[PDB]
Design a protein around this ligand. Sequence first.
Ligand code: 2GO
Ligand code: 2GO
Ligand code: 2GO
Ligand code: 2GO
Ligand SMILES: COC(C)(C)C/C=C/C(C)=C/C=C/C(C)=C/C=C/C(C)=C/C=C\C=C(C)\C=C\C=C(/C)CC/C=C(\C)CCC=C(C)C
Ligand SMILES: CCCCCCCCCCCC[N+](C)(C)[O-]
Ligand SMILES: CCCCCCCCCCCC[N+](C)(C)[O-]
Ligand SMILES: CCCCCCCCCCCC[N+](C)(C)[O-]
Ligand SMILES: [Fe+3]
Lengths: 281, 240, 302
Amino acid sequence: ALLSFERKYRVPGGTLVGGNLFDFWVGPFYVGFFGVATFFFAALGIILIAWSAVLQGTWNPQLISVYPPALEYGLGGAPLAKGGLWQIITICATGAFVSWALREVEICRKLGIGYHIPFAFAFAILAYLTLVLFRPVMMGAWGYAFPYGIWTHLDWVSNTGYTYGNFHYNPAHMIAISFFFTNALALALHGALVLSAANPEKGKEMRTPDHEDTFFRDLVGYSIGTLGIHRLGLLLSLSAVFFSALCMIITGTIWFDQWVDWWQWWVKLPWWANIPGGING
Amino acid sequence: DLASLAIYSFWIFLAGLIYYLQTENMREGYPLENEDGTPAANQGPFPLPKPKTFILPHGRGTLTVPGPESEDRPIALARTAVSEGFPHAPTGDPMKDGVGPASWVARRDLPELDGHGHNKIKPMKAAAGFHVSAGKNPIGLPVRGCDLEIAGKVVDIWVDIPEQMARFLEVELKDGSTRLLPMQMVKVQSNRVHVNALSSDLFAGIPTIKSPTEVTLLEEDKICGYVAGGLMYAAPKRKS
Amino acid sequence: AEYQNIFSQVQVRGPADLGMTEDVNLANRSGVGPFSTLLGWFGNAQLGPIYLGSLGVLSLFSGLMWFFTIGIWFWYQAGWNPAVFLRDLFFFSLEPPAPEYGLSFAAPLKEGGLWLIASFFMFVAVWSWWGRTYLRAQALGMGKHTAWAFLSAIWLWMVLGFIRPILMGSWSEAVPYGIFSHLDWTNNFSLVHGNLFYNPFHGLSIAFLYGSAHLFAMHGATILAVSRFGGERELEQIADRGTAAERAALFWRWTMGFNATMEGIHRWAIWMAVLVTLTGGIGILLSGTVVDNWYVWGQNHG
Ligand code: 2GO
Ligand code: 2GO
Ligand code: 2GO
Ligand code: 2GO
Ligand SMILES: COC(C)(C)C/C=C/C(C)=C/C=C/C(C)=C/C=C/C(C)=C/C=C\C=C(C)\C=C\C=C(/C)CC/C=C(\C)CCC=C(C)C
Ligand SMILES: CCCCCCCCCCCC[N+](C)(C)[O-]
Ligand SMILES: CCCCCCCCCCCC[N+](C)(C)[O-]
Ligand SMILES: CCCCCCCCCCCC[N+](C)(C)[O-]
Ligand SMILES: [Fe+3]
C-alpha cells in the first residue's frame, strides 16, 4: 500500500549491487541487495541472542545478556557460551548496520536526494565500533567492550566510568555533553518556532519565515535562518557523537589514570603554579 | 507508592502522545492506496485525525487537512509485474514526463510571497540593492554539464529576499533563452560553474518559467525535479 | 565530488532587514548590528536588531547581577589575585548554606547568604526572560510553543535549585555555582541516591536526550538532502506540499516503514526535546523526597 503520492517515485533504478534483482518493495519497505543483507545479519544475530538466552538459561528481557570474552582471551576467539556468541553477534550487528546504511544510499539514489542521512547514520555506527572494536582492540581484549543486555550494559557504563574516578572530568566528555545538551535545546527551539509560525493565535494567518527570523532577533538579537538551523541540528548532533567516540577511544589508551588529575596540566603551568592563595596553594 | 504511580502515569501519557503524534503525521498522503489509486484495505491501527485548517496569508486561501488526495496530473508510468510491490517503468522519457527522481508535484502556480506580500524570490538585478557579499561571484561564468560540455553562461542569481540567500543561477543557453538551475546542484569553481546532474544537451529540456522576473512554486518543482532526475537518467552521458 | 550545502558557496546581502511589525512596539527595537560574513557561511550574516523593553532590561541586568555576584566571590577566593583567579577558575565555587540553616535566610554572606543572593538574581532573570519569550510571540501573533517548551527546561532548573531544596527542608540540598563543584554535586547526588541509573525517569531522560540527537540528525540531514527542491522552506511546504516534502516522507517510509509530515516532524521534535527535561525534573523531584535509594526501589520494581 502506497501513500497517495508514492507511485510516481517507485521507478526502477539506483541500486548499487544486483541491478534489478532485488529492486522492489515488501509493503512500504524498500528491499534491494542491502535490504536482504540486513535481514540476513539481523536474523542471524537475533537467533544467536535467543540462543545465548538458553545457554545462560532465561527468557526475560530484563535479564538476557550476552557477554564478551573474558580478558584472559585477549583478541582471540572464545567458545560460544563464553563470549563467542557475542563475538559473532557483534559481527552480525556491524553487518546489519552497514547494510542499513548502504540500503539508505540506494533509496537516496532512487529518490534523487543527497546522501546526508546515511552519512549521518555513519556517525552512530562509528560510535558503536569504538565501543566494541576500536577501543577493545587497542586495549588488547574483547572483554573491554560492553555486553548486550539492557540493565547489564548500564553496569558496564558505570564500572568503566568509575574506573577513572568521576568520568565527568574527561574533557572530550564535557564537550560531547555540551553538544548533546545544545542539540536538545536547538531541537526544542526549532520545533517550537516552525510550529508557532504554522499554528498562530486563533483566527490569525500562518506566519512566515520573516516572522521566524523576526522572533529570534527580537528575543536574542540573532536568527540563524531556516537553512542554518538544519545545518546546526546536524552539526550539533554529529559533533556530540564524534566527541563521544573520541572521549572513549582515548580512555584506557592515551590516558588511563584518574581523569580529574589530568587537569593539573593547567594548574601547574609555571607562570602561576606557586603563587600562594586560591584553591590550589 | 508515589514513584510507581508517577511512572505508570507517565507511560499512559506517553502512549497517548504517540497516538496524537502519529495521527498528526497522517494529514498528508493518507488514506493509503493500492497501485491503481483505490483505497487500500489495510490502513493499519491509526485512524485519520479530525481535520485542521490553516489560513494562508495574502488571500491565498486556506489548506485543510486531512483532505481528498489526488496527484492532479498525468503520471507516465506502467506496472512491470502482475503483483503489488514492483517498480513502475516509465512509459515515455521520464525526465520530460516528470517521473521517478525527475518528479514534480502540482503545487500552486504562484510564487511564494514574503511577509510583506512581495515575491520571495527575484533575480538579483531586480532586487534592490542586493549584491554578492562574499565568495566567488558566479555571474558571467560558463556553465559545464557532466559530459564536460559548456551548456551556457550565468547571467544572474535569483535570490531569496527575506532570507538573503541565493537560490538559483539563471543561465543563458546557446539559443538566448535562460533557465534556472537550483543553487544546490551547481558547484561554483574559479573559472566555471559545474553541474554534475545534467549533460549539456539536457539543459534546453529544463522546464521554463512563464514570466521572466518571477517563479511559481509549481515551476520550482518542475525545475528542481528535472535537474535532480538528471543524476539517474543522464548516467549514460556522465563521465566523471 | 558533489556540493553538500553544509556551508554556502556565495553569500548575498541586501538592505538591513528590520523585520515584521505586527503588534510590536517598534520604539523598543534597536537598529541593526553588524553583518558577519563568517556566520554567513553557515547561517544568516545579519546581527540584530534586538528588542529591549522593561522585562528585557530587568533580565539582562538581573543576569549580570547573578553573574558578577559569583565572580566577586571568585576573586575574593583568589585573594584578589589575577593569576590565581585564572589558574583556579574551574575550582572556585559559591556554595549554598549549610544544612543547620535549613530554609532560613539567616546564614552569613560568606557562608551561604551570598548564594541566596545570586540564586535570587537568577530566579528573577530566568522567569523574566520566560515572560519575554511569551510576549515576543504574542506581539508577532505567533503561537506560544517556544514559551511552553522553555517552560520544560525551567521545570528541571526549578526542581534542582528551589522546589526540591524546599521539600527536603534545606537550601544545602541545592546546587553550587562553580564549574567543577557542580559536576561533583552531580556525581555525589547519584551516589547518595543509590545510582541514578535505576531511576526510571533518569533512563527516560537519557532516551529522549539520545533521541533528540538521533532525531535532529535525521531531520537536519533530511531537510539538507531535499534542500535541492526547496525543503528548508518548511512553512510553505506545509501549506502546499512539494516534491521536497514527498521525497523526504518516502525516504523514511521505504527505510523504516513509516514516516512524517513536514509539520508533524516538528511535533515529534518539540516533544522528544521537551521530554528530556520533563522526565528529568520528575526523576530528581522524587529523589530524596519519596525515594532515598533507586536501586532499592528498583528491587521492589516499585
Ligand atoms: C527543553 C530542554 C532544553 C534543555 C536541553 C536546555 C538546556 C539548557 C542548558 C544546559 C544544557 O545546561 C543551558 C546552560 C541553557 C540555557 C538557556 N536556555 Zn535552555 N534548554 C532547553 C530548551 C530551551 C528553550 C525552548 C528555550 C531555552 C532558553 C534558554 C536560555 C535562558 C536565557 C536566560 O535565562 O537569560 C537571563 C540572563 C542573561 C541573558 C545574562 C546571563 C549572564 C551572561 C553569562 C553574561 C554574558 C553575556 C551578556 C548577556 C552580555 C551583555 C553585554 C552588555 C555590555 C550589554 C539560555 C540560553 C530560552 C532562549 O531564550 O533560547 C535561546 C528558550 O526560549 N532552552 N539551556
Ligand atoms: C551510548 C553509551 C552507552 C552505550 C554502550 C549504549 C549503547 C546502546 C546500544 C548500541 C550501541 O547498540 C543500544 C541499541 C542501546 C539501547 C539502549 N540503551 Zn544504551 N548505551 C549506553 C548508555 C546508556 C545509558 C546511560 C542508558 C542507556 C539506555 C538504553 C535504552 C534507551 C535508548 C534510546 O532511547 O536511544 C535513542 C534512540 C532512539 C530513541 C531510537 C530508538 C532506539 C530503540 C529504543 C532501540 C532498542 C534496542 C533493543 C532493546 C535492543 C534489541 C536488539 C535486537 C534484539 C532487536 C536502550 C535499551 C537507557 C536505559 O534506560 O537502559 C536501561 C539509559 O539510561 N544506554 N544502548
Ligand atoms: C549520529 C547521531 C545520532 C546518535 C545520537 C544516534 C543514537 C542512537 C542510539 C543510542 C542513543 O543508543 C540508538 C539505540 C539509535 C538507534 C537507531 N538509530 Zn540512531 N542516532 C543518531 C543518528 C541516526 C541517523 C542519521 C540514523 C539513525 C538510525 C537509527 C536506527 C538504526 C536501525 C538499524 O540500523 O537497523 C539495522 C539492524 C537491525 C534492524 C537489527 C540489528 C540486530 C543486531 C544484529 C543484534 C543486536 C545487537 C545490539 C548491539 C544489541 C544491543 C542491545 C543492548 C545495548 C540493550 C536505530 C533505530 C537510522 C534510522 O533508520 O532511523 C530510523 C538512521 O538513518 N541514527 N541511535
Ligand atoms: C555520576 C553522574 C550520574 C550518572 C549515573 C549519570 C550518567 C548519565 C549518562 C551516561 C552514563 O552516559 C547520561 C547520558 C546521563 C544523562 C542525563 N542525566 Zn545523568 N547521571 C548522573 C547523575 C545525574 C544527576 C544528578 C542529574 C542527571 C540528569 C541527567 C539528564 C539531564 C538532561 C538535561 O538536559 O539537563 C540540562 C538542562 C538543564 C539542567 C536545564 C537548565 C535550564 C535553565 C533554565 C537555563 C539557565 C541559563 C543560565 C541563566 C545561563 C545563561 C547563559 C548565557 C550565555 C545566555 C540527562 C538526560 C539530570 C536529570 O534530569 O536527572 C533525572 C540531573 O539532575 N544525572 N546521565
Ligand atoms: C572576570 O570577572 C568578572 C568579575 C568580570 C565576572 C566573572 C564572573 C565569573 C567567572 C562567573 C562564573 C560563574 C559560573 C562559573 C557559574 C556557574 C554556574 C553553574 C554551573 C550553575 C548550575 C546550576 C544552577 C542551578 C541549578 C540553579 C538553580 C537556581 C534556582 C532554581 C533559583 C533558586 C532561587 C533561590 C534559591 C532564591 C530564593 C529567594 C526567593 C526570593 C525566591
Ligand atoms: C539483548 C537485549 C534483550 C532484548 C529483549 C527483547 C526486546 C523486546 C522489547 C522489550 C520489552 C520488555 N517488556 C515490555 C516485556 O517488558
Ligand atoms: C549554539 C552554538 C553554540 C556552540 C557551542 C556548543 C557547545 C560546545 C562547548 C565546548 C566548546 C568546544 N569547541 C566546540 C570549541 O570545540
Ligand atoms: C517521542 C517518542 C520516542 C520514543 C523514545 C523512547 C523509548 C523508550 C526507552 C526505554 C527506557 C526504559 N526505562 C528503564 C527508562 O524506563
Ligand atoms: Fe525543520
